């Protein structure tokens, strides 16, 4: 059975974690290899249990007749957007959870836009909490609103599956009868509609290995005796022990080193490929030479830059942005892969300001170099709000 990565996204409290638990229980009735997980086993940290909130992304495994799934359950709270982005970057498809009782909310919109920015190719929708809605008209409206949102963000909104169900009632049924099978219960069958939907709508992924190697540095560790280890998810290409690599960005100059080891969890590998979360041991360099925000790459394949042009969508308040636009001189934070760097905006000649809801173009000068290339997507934040989502269109300096 091929392996596929999926996950749950959506506004705070709409039901992501409860749905994740339900998925493990429902799938386990048809497969003895699946380990069932209760709500408290997913939101397992003391703080998560205390306030009933997802803080850390959780990784759970389950399977269908067709595939083995690794599911990343993401937090919906704005305070943990970094963890949500980190989780979305691992997904081959995402399950957008939308409460039928509340309808789309700011992070319903923001999560779809950000999922697109990180490269999630497909979204399946689970309209949750329908057990709380007795009005069929409202359900139709919520579905229309969600399909409209998906269309607005360039996903095939009229094609995507929109499953109407109750994660809670399905989970309660599985607790009462862990062997409930297909066809026996309406709520459990809605979970099967979702499992069948991810099986048929999320394409079997093809790792992006036919490209020069690049891995954003997530974190850096010094293993006593072994050396400096840079962790990250390989974005493209492959890396083998003995390969020469460049550390690009942030520092005054690019630095070269050699890969002396590749590991994944407690496994020693001789090579890592696109899609792998790995620890890369680097020759000679210390933590003073490799840090979060830099990238490791095939030498000569990407260079550091500070000035670029970009196409940017300016977010509205209801999408996580602001009601007001901005002018030349604006100094927000720019996020490229694992980099966070301040930059200064310069609007094109004749453009006084750019407004929320518009797709505009402008120039940016960063305060430190970043590994940049045409086609690189990014986000702009200011004051804890996502003000723009963009893509680099031209390298100037
Ligand atoms: C044993 O000790 C250590 C450790 O504990 C072990 O860990 C288990 C470790 O084990 C290793 C062997 C191994 O098993 C473990 C390896 C671990 C690897 C971890 C990998 C990851 O997190 C990756 C998914 C991420 O970087 C991921 C791609 C990164 C993660 C990046 C997250 C960024 C968040 C920013 C938030 C902003 O405020 C924001 O509000 C906003 C809206 C920004 C949007 C930004 C966008 C849109 C950027 C895009 O330009 C883009 C394409 C982003 C996607 C991106 O780059 O994601 O060994 C060590 C030695
Ligand atoms: N009535 C009803 N309540 C539900 C349903 N699904 C989840 N809930 C409830 O709504 C609350 C939030 O659920 P939870 O799964 O934690 O939501 P979340 O989207 O994971 N939250 P966060 O964004 O913090 O991660 C809980 O009290 C939970 O029992 C459902 O189908 N029906
Ligand atoms: Mg949750």
Q: What is the CATH number of the domain that holds 285?
A: 2.40.30.10
Verify whether residue 111 is a known catalytic residue: no
DSSP 203: P
**Contacts with 340 (C-beta within 8 Å, 6 or more apart), sequence order:** 293, 333, 334
Tell whether 215 and 178 lie within a shared domain.
Answer: no
The answer on 252 and 167 residing in a single domain is: no
Q: Are residues 59 and 166 in the same domain?
A: yes
Q: Which residues pair with 70 in a beta bridge?
A: 5, 61
Residue having the nearest C-alpha atom to atom 27 of ligand 1: 86
Burial class from Cβ neighbours inside 10 Å (0-12, 13-18, 19+) for residue 383 reads: exposed
336 lies in the same domain as 350? yes
Question: Is the same domain home to 163 and 20?
Answer: yes
Is 305 annotated as contributing to ligand binding? no
- Whether 165 and 224 map to the same domain: the answer is no
33 alpha-carbon distance from chain centroid: 27
| Resolution for this experimental structure (Å) | 1.4
Q: Exposed/middle/buried for 126, CB within 10 Å: 0-12, 13-18, 19+?
A: buried
Q: Quick one: 224 and 294 in the same domain?
A: yes
Q: Is 224 a catalytic residue?
A: no
254's CB contacts (< 8 A; 6+ apart) are 246, 247, 248, 303, 304
Neighbours of ion ligand 3 (CB under 5 A): 16-17, 54
Residue 308 CA to residue 394 CA, distance in Å, equals 6
Q: Is 345 annotated as a binding residue?
A: no
Q: 186-201 vs 167-176: helix axis angle to the nearest 10?
A: 110
Q: How far apart are the C-alpha atoms of 272 and 156, rounded to whole Å?
A: 33
End-to-end Cα distance, the chain: 47
Q: Which of 46, 47, 48, 21 is nearest to 35 (CA)?
A: 21
54 lines ligand 2 (CB under 6 A): yes
Question: For residue 26, how far is the Cα from the chain centroid?
Answer: 25
Identify whether residues 148 and 269 lie together within a single domain: no
Do 351 and 284 belong to one domain? no
- Residue 339: CB atoms within 10 Å: 24
Instruction: Check pocket membership of 265 for ligand 1, CB cut-off 6 A.
Output: yes
Catalytic annotation on 228?
A: no
Taking the CA atoms of residue 10, residue 57, residue 239 and residue 392 in that order, the dihedral angle to the nearest 10 degrees is: 40
Q: Strand, coil or helix: what is 304?
A: strand
Instruction: Please tell me whether 15 is known to bind a ligand.
Output: yes
Q: What's the number of domains the chain is made of? A: 3
By residue range, what is the domain housing residue 310?
A: 303-396
Q: Three-state SS string across 310-355, please? A: EEEEECCHHHCCCCCCECCCCCCEEEECCEEEEEEEECCCCCCCEC
Same domain, 82 and 146: yes
Claim to verify: residue 236 and residue 335 sit in the same structural domain: no
11, 152, 185, 261, 299 from 193: Cα distances, Å: 22, 25, 12, 43, 47
Q: From the candidates 3, 59, 77, 316, give the one annotated as an active-site residue.
A: 77
82: domain CATH number is: 3.40.50.300
Q: Which residues neighbour 114 within 8 Å (Cβ) at sequence distance 6 or greater? A: 81, 84, 85, 88, 379, 386, 389
Please state the φ and ψ torsions of residue 242, each to the nearest 5 degrees: 100, -15
Domain boundary among the residues 246, 275, 299 is at: 299
Of 281, 299, 317, the one marking the end of a domain is 299
Q: Where are the alpha helices (DSSP H) in the chain?
A: 16-29, 39-42, 46-51, 81-88, 106-117, 136-152, 167-176, 186-201
In contact, 182 and 36? CB cutoff 8 Å: no
Instruction: Choose the final residue of a domain: 205, 229, 260.
Output: 205
Radius of gyration of the chain (CA): 22
Quote the CA–CA distance of 297 and 236 in Å, as a whole number: 9
Contact, 294 vs 251, CB < 8 A? yes
Q: Which residues 6+ apart lie within 8 Å of 283 measured at CB?
A: 227, 257, 258, 259, 260
Residues 71 and 216 in one domain: no
Q: Is 17 a catalytic residue?
A: yes
216 CA to centre of ligand 1 in angstroms: 8
């Amino acid at each position: 059975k091929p392996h596929v990565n999926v996950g749950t996204i959506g506004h705070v409290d709409h039901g992501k974690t409860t749905l994740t638990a339900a998925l493990t229980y429902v799938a386990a009735a048809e497969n003895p290899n699946v380990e069932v997980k209760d709500y408290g086993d997913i939101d397992k940290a003391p703080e998560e249990r205390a306030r009933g909130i997802t803080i850390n992304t959780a990784h759970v495994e389950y399977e269908t007749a067709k595939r083995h799934y690794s599911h990343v359950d993401c937090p919906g709270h704005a305070d943990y957007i970094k963890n949500m982005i980190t989780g979305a970057a691992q997904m081959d498809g995402a399950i957008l959870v939308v409460s039928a009782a509340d309808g789309p909310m700011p992070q319903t919109r923001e999560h779809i836009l950000l999922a697109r920015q990180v490269g999630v190719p497909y979204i399946v929708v689970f309209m949750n909490k329908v057990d709380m809605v007795d009005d069929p008209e409202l359900l139709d409206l919520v579905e229309m609103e969600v399909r409209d949102l998906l269309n607005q963000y360039e996903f095939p909104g009229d094609e995507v599956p929109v499953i109407r169900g109750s994660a809670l009632l399905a989970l309660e049924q599985m607790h009462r009868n862990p062997k409930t099978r297909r066809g026996e219960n309406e709520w459990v069958d809605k979970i099967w509609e979702l499992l069948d939907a991810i099986d048929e709508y999320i394409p079997t992924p093809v790792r992006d290995v036919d490209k020069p190697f690049l891995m954003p540095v997530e974190d850096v560790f010094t293993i006593t005796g072994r050396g400096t280890v840079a962790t990250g998810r390989i974005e493209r290409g492959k890396v083998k022990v003995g390969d020469e690599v460049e550390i690009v960005g942030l520092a005054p100059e690019t630095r070269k080193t050699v890969v002396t080891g590749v590991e994944m969890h407690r496994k020693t590998l001789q090579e890592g490929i696109a899609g792998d979360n790995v620890g890369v041991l680097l020759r000679g360099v210390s933590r003073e030479e490799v840090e979060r925000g830099q990238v490791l790459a095939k030498p000569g394949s990407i260079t550091p830059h500070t000035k670029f042009e970009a196409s940017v969508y300016v977010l509205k308040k209801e999408e996580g942005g602001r009601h007001t636009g901005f002018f030349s001189g604006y100094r927000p934070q720019f996020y490229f892969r694992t980099t966070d760097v301040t930059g200064v905006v310069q609007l094109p000649p004749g453009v006084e300001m750019v407004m929320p809801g518009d797709n505009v173009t402008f120039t940016v000068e960063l305060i430190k170099p970043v590994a940049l290339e045409e086609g690189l997507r990014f986000a702009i934040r200011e004051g804890g709000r996502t003000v723009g989502a963009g893509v680099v269109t031209k390298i100037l300096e």
